[PDB]
Design a protein around this ligand. Structure first.
Ligand SMILES: *[C@@H]1O[C@H](CO)[C@@H](O[C@@H]2O[C@H](CO)[C@@H](O)[C@H](O)[C@H]2NC(C)=O)[C@H](O)[C@H]1NC(C)=O
Ligand SMILES: *[C@@H]1O[C@H](CO)[C@@H](O)[C@H](O)[C@H]1NC(C)=O
Ligand SMILES: *[C@@H]1O[C@H](CO)[C@@H](O)[C@H](O)[C@H]1NC(C)=O
Lengths: 105, 99
């Protein structure tokens, strides 16, 4: 159904044949980032739910794979599995939690 | 004195044409596909080549088959050892069995 990520197609008639106009999505402008598999926080390993942990020169973010939409690393979009000495390439960073500013108010 | 079949086939008007693509070019296509697959996953098949670490690519595949990626990230050495033993089994079977 075409080359790229398929969205739609439109048929057209032709003499002794058919013609398909496949609509596809193609990524355009890539950018380099520094990545890591997991985030170590308080002796816990945080993995992304559906996304990728990337970093610019200072901070760390979690974003979707096919588009650059960075967001703050939160316990809402991450899950905890085990501790920090089982993952190769784990990096230390803090993980924001939404309940704490509600508690400190 | 040992007359071949191919000499009689050529002398009786039958000719075998050579293919357009040589084995070196076929192997270079295979090498390009392997290098693109290893260093970019599937993104090179859908546009530009996007680099990714291979452990994270395998975690993407594990999420593809419905398994949580911590299973990969806590069993990476065992999975790599199983892959190496499987590749050795394939090369030993191809060395042994000719059928
Ligand atoms: C990397 O990302 C961080 C994210 O915090 C950027 O830091 C922010 O930069 C803007 C300037 O555009 C400031 O207004 C913010 O106050 C900064 N945030 C913090 C928490 O300090 C940073 O600029 C990005 N780039 C580099 C090169 O580090
Ligand atoms: C990313 O890094 C590589 C290696 O340094 C470089 O060749 C490339 O231009 C950079 N940028 C992009 C968008 O790939
Ligand atoms: C992360 O923090 C722990 C304890 O605070 C420390 O032992 C470990 O070395 C840190 N990680 C890195 C990569 O420095």
């Amino acid at each position: 159904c075409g080359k790229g990520y398929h969205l739609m197609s439109f048929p057209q008639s032709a003499p002794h044949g058919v013609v398909f106009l496949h609509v596809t999505y193609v990524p355009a402008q890539e950018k380099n980032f520094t990545t890591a598999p997991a985030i170590c926080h308080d002796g816990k390993a945080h993995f992304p739910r559906e996304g990728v942990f990337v970093s610019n020169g200072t901070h760390w973010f979690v974003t979707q794979r096919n588009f650059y939409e960075p967001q703050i690393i939160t316990t809402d979009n991450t899950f905890v599995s085990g501790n920090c000495d089982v993952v190769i390439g784990i990096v230390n960073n803090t993980v924001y939690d939404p309940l704490q500013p509600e508690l400190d108010s | 004195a040992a007359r071949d079949l191919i000499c009689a086939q050529k002398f009786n008007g039958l000719t075998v044409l050579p293919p357009l693509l040589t084995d070196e070019m076929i192997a270079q296509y295979t090498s390009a596909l392997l290098a693109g697959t290893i260093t970019s996953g599937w993104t090179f098949g859908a546009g530009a080549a996007l680099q990714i670490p291979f452990a994270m690519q395998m975690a993407y595949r594990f999420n593809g088959i419905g398994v949580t990626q911590n299973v990969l990230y806590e069993n990476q050495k065992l999975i790599a050892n199983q892959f190496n033993s499987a590749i050795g089994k394939i090369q030993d079977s191809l060395s042994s069995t000719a059928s």
